[PDB]
Amino acid sequence: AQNPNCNIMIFHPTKEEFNDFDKYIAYMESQGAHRAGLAKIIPPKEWKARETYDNISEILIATPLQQVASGRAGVFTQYHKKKKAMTVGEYRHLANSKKYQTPPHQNFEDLERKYWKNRIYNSPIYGADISGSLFDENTKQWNLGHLGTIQDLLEKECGVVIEGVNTPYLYFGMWKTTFAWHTEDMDLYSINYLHLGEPKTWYVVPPEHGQRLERLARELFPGSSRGCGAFLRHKVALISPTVLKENGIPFNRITQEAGEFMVTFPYGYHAGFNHGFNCAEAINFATPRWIDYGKMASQCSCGEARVTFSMDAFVRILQPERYDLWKRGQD
Ligand SMILES: O=C(O)CNC(=O)C(=O)O
Ligand SMILES: [Mg+2]
Ligand code: NI
Ligand SMILES: [Zn+2]
């Protein structure tokens, strides 16, 4: 069995290997990359996403989200408070202000320590989930707005044509902006490209050990767990590396820098934080290996998780027994 310790693997495809996306995902899996739940892909030196980032300041962040924490330093939830619209130029200025800027630090490890010690005492503002793309239309390789769609994959594998579309999302981050412990909708893959700015630190639980994280989460968030049998779908719970180690939960960590892709694999729980002002782009995708994970994916039916239009068909076709209850939670 390849990669039996479930380590995060880093790949350096050549320009020729960067042509066929599906084929390279399948290569990474042949080497065991999926066992970790997350892989890093460093593009060939000849590649670029676009010519420059000099003209992005007029993008609008219609609903910036202030991420307010409750709990203790290593075990907390966050809620998202909606703020007034602002442009990317305005947001960048805010991120760099004395109230929000990254503190002085020695290295990534020192910054990680400061994150876990101090995150709860501040409420950073995240421009998340903005439909759109920063890839140039002329970038033909690993362009996140030109991937094969999940609807076409389901049709190819299963023969059923379904409604729905699949487009990318932009994330503008600042120091301490946080992504809570989650898997993707319907336990899909995700791919994330860090276009510019400061790094993003990731933590991940191997898919084969996801239920260990869920069991801890139920213990640590007992009110939430009573409210919903899949409350990590709400994307609000954080657990530090120190707490995971104390409870014996297998995980790994890695820092993504500008110009690098990360791929999350089906049922790979992940969480993390941004080091300072940055912009990432991400999208879900599927492969043939996903189908069995989509059929088994947990679902939130309590009403909180509220998701895209396009998840309807996935539940309807892959999980017909669950469909009626899940849709009640949508309505
Ligand atoms: O970048 C973020 O805030 C969150 N991204 C992801 O969870 C992802 O790409 O799967
Ligand atoms: Mg602009
Ligand atoms: Ni994700
Ligand atoms: Zn729920």
From Swiss-Prot:
Residues 136-302 form the JmjC domain. Its main location: nucleus. GO terms for cellular component: blood microparticle; chromatin; nucleoplasm; nucleus; pericentric heterochromatin; site of double-strand break. One of its GO terms (biological process) is chromatin remodeling. Keywords: ADP-ribosylation, Chromatin regulator, Dioxygenase, Iron, Metal-binding, Nucleus, Oxidoreductase, Transcription, Transcription regulation, Ubl conjugation, Zinc. Its cofactor is Fe(2+). The modification PolyADP-ribosyl glutamic acid is found at E16, E17. It is found in: Nucleus. Belongs to the JHDM3 histone demethylase family. Histone demethylase that specifically demethylates 'Lys-9' of histone H3, thereby playing a central role in histone code. Does not demethylate histone H3 'Lys-4', H3 'Lys-27', H3 'Lys-36' nor H4 'Lys-20'. Demethylates both di- and trimethylated H3 'Lys-9' residue, while it has no activity on monomethylated residues. Demethylation of Lys residue generates formaldehyde and succinate. This is Lysine-specific demethylase 4D. It comes from Homo sapiens. The gene is KDM4D.
